[PDB]
Design a binder for this molecule. Sequence first.
Ligand SMILES: Nc1ncnc2c1ncn2[C@@H]1O[C@H](COP(=O)(O)OP(=O)(O)OP(=O)(O)O)[C@@H](O)[C@H]1O
Ligand SMILES: Nc1ncnc2c1ncn2[C@@H]1O[C@H](COP(=O)(O)OP(=O)(O)OP(=O)(O)O)[C@@H](O)[C@H]1O
Ligand SMILES: Nc1ncnc2c1ncn2[C@@H]1O[C@H](COP(=O)(O)OP(=O)(O)OP(=O)(O)O)[C@@H](O)[C@H]1O
Ligand SMILES: Nc1ncnc2c1ncn2[C@@H]1O[C@H](COP(=O)(O)OP(=O)(O)OP(=O)(O)O)[C@@H](O)[C@H]1O
Lengths: 578, 367, 379
Amino acid sequence: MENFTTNLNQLARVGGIDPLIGREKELERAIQVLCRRRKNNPLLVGESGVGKTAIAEGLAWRIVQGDVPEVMADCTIYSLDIGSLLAGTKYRGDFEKRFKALLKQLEQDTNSILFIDEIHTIIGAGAASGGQVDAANLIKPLLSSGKIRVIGSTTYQEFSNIFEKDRALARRFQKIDITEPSIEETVQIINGLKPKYEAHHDVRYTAKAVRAAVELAVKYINDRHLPDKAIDVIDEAGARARLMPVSKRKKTVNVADIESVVARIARIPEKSVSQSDRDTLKNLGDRLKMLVFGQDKAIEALTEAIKMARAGLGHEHKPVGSFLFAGPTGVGKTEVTVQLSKALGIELLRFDMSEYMERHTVSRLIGAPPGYVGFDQGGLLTDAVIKHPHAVLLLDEIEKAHPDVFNILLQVMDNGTLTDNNGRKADFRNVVLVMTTNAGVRETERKSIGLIHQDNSTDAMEEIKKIFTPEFRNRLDNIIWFDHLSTDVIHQVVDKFIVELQVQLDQKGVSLEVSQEARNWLAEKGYDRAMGARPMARVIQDNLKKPLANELLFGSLVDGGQVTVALDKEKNELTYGF
Amino acid sequence: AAVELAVKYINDRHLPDKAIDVIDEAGARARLMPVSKRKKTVNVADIESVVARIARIPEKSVSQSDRDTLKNLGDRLKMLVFGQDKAIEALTEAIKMARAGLGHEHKPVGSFLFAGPTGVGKTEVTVQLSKALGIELLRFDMSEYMERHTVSRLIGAPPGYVGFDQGGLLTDAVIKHPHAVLLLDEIEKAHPDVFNILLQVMDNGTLTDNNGRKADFRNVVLVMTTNAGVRETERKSIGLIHQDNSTDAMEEIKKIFTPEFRNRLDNIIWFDHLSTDVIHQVVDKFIVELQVQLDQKGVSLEVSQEARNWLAEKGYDRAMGARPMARVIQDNLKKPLANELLFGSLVDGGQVTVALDKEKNELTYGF
Amino acid sequence: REKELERAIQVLCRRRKNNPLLVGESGVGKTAIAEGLAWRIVQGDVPEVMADCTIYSLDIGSLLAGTKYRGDFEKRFKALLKQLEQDTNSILFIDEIHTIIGAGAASGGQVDAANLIKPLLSSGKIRVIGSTTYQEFSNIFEKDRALARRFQKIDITEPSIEETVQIINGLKPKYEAHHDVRYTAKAVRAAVELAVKYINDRHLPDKAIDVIDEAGARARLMPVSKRKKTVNVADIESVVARIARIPEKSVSQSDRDTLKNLGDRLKMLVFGQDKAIEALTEAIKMARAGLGHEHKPVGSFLFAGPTGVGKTEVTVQLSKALGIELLRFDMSEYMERHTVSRLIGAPPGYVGFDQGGLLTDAVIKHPHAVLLLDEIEKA
Ligand SMILES: Nc1ncnc2c1ncn2[C@@H]1O[C@H](COP(=O)(O)OP(=O)(O)OP(=O)(O)O)[C@@H](O)[C@H]1O
Ligand SMILES: Nc1ncnc2c1ncn2[C@@H]1O[C@H](COP(=O)(O)OP(=O)(O)OP(=O)(O)O)[C@@H](O)[C@H]1O
Ligand SMILES: Nc1ncnc2c1ncn2[C@@H]1O[C@H](COP(=O)(O)OP(=O)(O)OP(=O)(O)O)[C@@H](O)[C@H]1O
Ligand SMILES: Nc1ncnc2c1ncn2[C@@H]1O[C@H](COP(=O)(O)OP(=O)(O)OP(=O)(O)O)[C@@H](O)[C@H]1O
């Protein structure tokens, strides 16, 4: 035992193991179990990071501090490192001699408790031959006879998958469920532990820093439990603050440092909103109007959703915003979204919904159910939002997906979550959801029969309503109708496309000038309300790019020249040059 | 009592030692009593306390603060969910019976199907119930169980398969939290094979997982929500008089959930549409949420009564429930505030006054 | 990678569970950073807190190698940890840290490297820097919750274009030394820009570097015939083009005439329908000229008409004339809605999941190709 276990009273008394705060009921049972006539061995079972070891060792602390029932007073708790019982072995029989020697020592002390953490690891030692499991074979009678007292500890999952197969062991200890504290209990736990962080990091925490670490961690960090989750924030903020005095920036850790840390851990930005990001955001609405012409209202809706979220007036558990972009083809429905993600500097997660035409294609978003082929793959959607929690999520031509696929978004739009096939949750609260569609267009573009042409603008009233179930629609922030582009827009579109052409040419060492007459001509020639801005690229392709490709490819316009294009008036034909 | 209670509440061990353990812990418990110098014998009440602790169930509520918490549970919920009183009452009645002891031998605390128009707090009330009671909410978006084979994610892969150690997500959630509110959202979206899992739960309080262990739902409140019948509810009839289609919505529910399912529910509660009175309450609720969000930035907010009356009058839509009201709040209050909070006077300001004129019915703003 | 290290240091500086885990896509510099810190410590490019501390890199294979008998592994494992605990100013670094979870427990037991490490991380006794990909982190580290709680995940993203150029400028001298080459400024900038435009299934820090290394390696085989030269943008372009399959610079050579005469080689084979020939010929020329569509296909043209008029023959002849692969897809075989899974594959969990997807594999194998979809109206 001398070099296999740790005397926890000795440790708790001299170095300290950090105080245990609260957990009155947890200890009440542990003691009542330890006080039983037989099988007086509690097992602390729970979610990782809830204080299972904190309690098991915390008991040693209470004993050395005298804060125990006299029954427990003066008893010694020893923690066993089973790794050391194997490190000292090699051939047959040495393990058992060593293992039993420790048991004899516990029996001889008579007033001691052994603590075995990771209790599910006591299964082992036997190998090659085996059948002698250690875990049960060397201790079943020790536990059932009351000769020794053992406190164990385990993760709830390990407990059911491993620590629960051996019924004989399952029967020999009383399980105590350690659940995670609530907000207040977490705050008091921090206050009790706080002096150790302040002492370790040479920092001090404000009342708000502590209050906030708990509330913020709960809201933003969701893969850990409260008592160790809020601590990471406090400890991390401490470690960060400790790196300031290096430039003499000695300071108290305040709520501002906590928010910076939570924001970094959760990858959700929070303080830059007060800095230059105010202008990046302020100007967002206009940068996008230089890329998508017309459609200002779509730009505003996106811009507004983002501003509210950055302002802090977002929702508590919804995507940044979620609206469907409907309209005629070639009017900037996907273009504004692509540009939004560029303007914001964030990842664009683009899915083509045309690929999800069968009901069973949902498995590509979620992953196969356990037990199936594609299980370890995970889901493509849930994974995309996990790697990039701050993103623009674009679902192109959503009306092409099998309609049951839309059901996947009900919980996304409403709770910001989606659960993958491993049970992990996607978190969409920092994702802008944009879905585009051509629903209703075929109808809006149809001519009616009669003397008076009917106004078919109520496409929203039929196709959008028939395609998207009421519960889907009622979760959208908006349904935004993109219009056909006007001729004023076409002129802007043509200018835009010519610039794109100029850039491709600049990269080849040549440049292009187009006269205004030539531009107006191309705009006038290509406009077709029905196809939006889509054909303008073809008009440019035929009137400017084809001529240029011949000049670029066969030597007429290569190194040494530039091309000027002008329109004549007689034929309205374009000129070219060098 | 140790013997007859252990067989009812402790189900992972055989009787000899299962009952002795109750006796032994009760013994130890009583042994730790005369430290206060109060000598004890072990009565039925001490046995019941031990079983309650071993089985992870509630003991006796009348002398507890739980008595008061339970007594006015309906009142607190009515402050969060307006209207739909009958749903609130059904939930609290089932709970009271269970704590009263007038429960079921082997069934969930109660089992309800929440049906009705959208935007009505079918989900909202369940979420608040778990908060009001202080217990874990176990959620399961049923839209994610659309294929016959998705059942294995609820109960785990069969042994020997790639998803065998993961276990089931449902049985594990229940095992970890035996006393909980279990919410199955949009249950009608799940593949019907899923309902077969629910039928046995509703009748026995239990599911066997892929490890052969059982989840005990005896202390779980089971609420599942649905939109079955909504498209029909919102349909307008042909004629001069619009018809009440709630009767057809039920026909839709009865086609999705077969008699075998329906007979295992304690109730099917058809939630009604929200009234204008409710909207006024809803608007105040949303404004308060806004005020809280603003307080977090150090900004106070006043909204006049007329501004409230107007927002409520503007946003009400009987068919869409309360969800649109939040849209009204975003456009009339949050957007203006975001600009002031982000680029203007409220950054280090801290105050905003909102009222409207009568001539334009436009809102005021500013520090 | 200043911020990536700032966080790593802040994690190492924590009181407990001060073990950063570097998680990211492959080829993004995760291990470059962990080794980079050892480099910075030695060079004095780190806070005094890290200064003078030793980072050791663990060979899991040598730790497990030879551990026969019951107890040798456990002994070696513990000896290592003891040595680290007695150093008091060291950090252990583990590549592919998810593999520690698979350390050899001898038999049916659970005593292995992860179970033996856990208490020393919780206690703050030792410091470990881990490294794993987002996929290995998800399928391995994410599952062992207790171990995962002892690491602080650092999210390492792919660098920008400007950042990639800068790492090349820093790394460059070693490629120059290794290959006996020198790289021009244009060569470096282009490796990054071109790799971004043309090389898929890789991340920048690696993608640009791979081009620099190969181009250096190409030039390394020139002064064997004493064709000594530097690596210019043209050589970088050639290397990327090897992968991209359509060079932007060779278009200026004999390729100009191969392309110029394309229209006539096709007119002599397909008669009438000159307009189809022109449509195809022009699309290619623009694409080779550089007047492409940035992200769209070379061109997409529906050929409609009476039978026996050369609609598929001209496309077949095009692929022949160009010297490129013809990918054929008979649309009549996709006569039903569900037949789409033949083109892209079955969803995960379904029979045939690992069979592939005919269209996506055809295109992936042959990036430069003519894709012909016969009788599209029959799909
Ligand atoms: N009363 C408490 N005493 C000590 N620690 C507590 C307490 N309550 C919560 N904690 C938190 O839990 C941790 C205490 O250590 P503990 O051994 O209990 O972890 P754990 O719950 O067993 O997690 P794991 O399964 O990974 O070992 C600390 O992070 C601490 O912030
Ligand atoms: N308002 C606009 N300003 C400038 N260019 C535009 C505009 N609208 C469309 N375009 C042009 O069309 C493209 C933008 O993509 P767009 O959003 O129109 O796709 P879409 O609306 O989804 O149509 P589809 O039905 O084919 O998917 C760009 O090439 C862009 O030059
Ligand atoms: N009776 C109510 N009182 C106040 N707010 C309500 C009420 N009912 C619904 N709401 C509003 O709805 C919001 C939550 O939506 P809810 O949970 O009710 O949708 P649902 O019941 O699931 O219906 P569906 O999903 O079919 O659209 C609440 O935050 C609340 O603002
Ligand atoms: N314009 C042409 N000039 C010379 N030969 C030709 C022409 N068209 C077709 N042919 C010949 O006739 C045969 C059929 O040609 P092809 O398959 O390309 O026509 P198609 O448009 O595909 O008809 P289908 O409607 O059946 O698909 C080929 O062997 C081809 O050599």
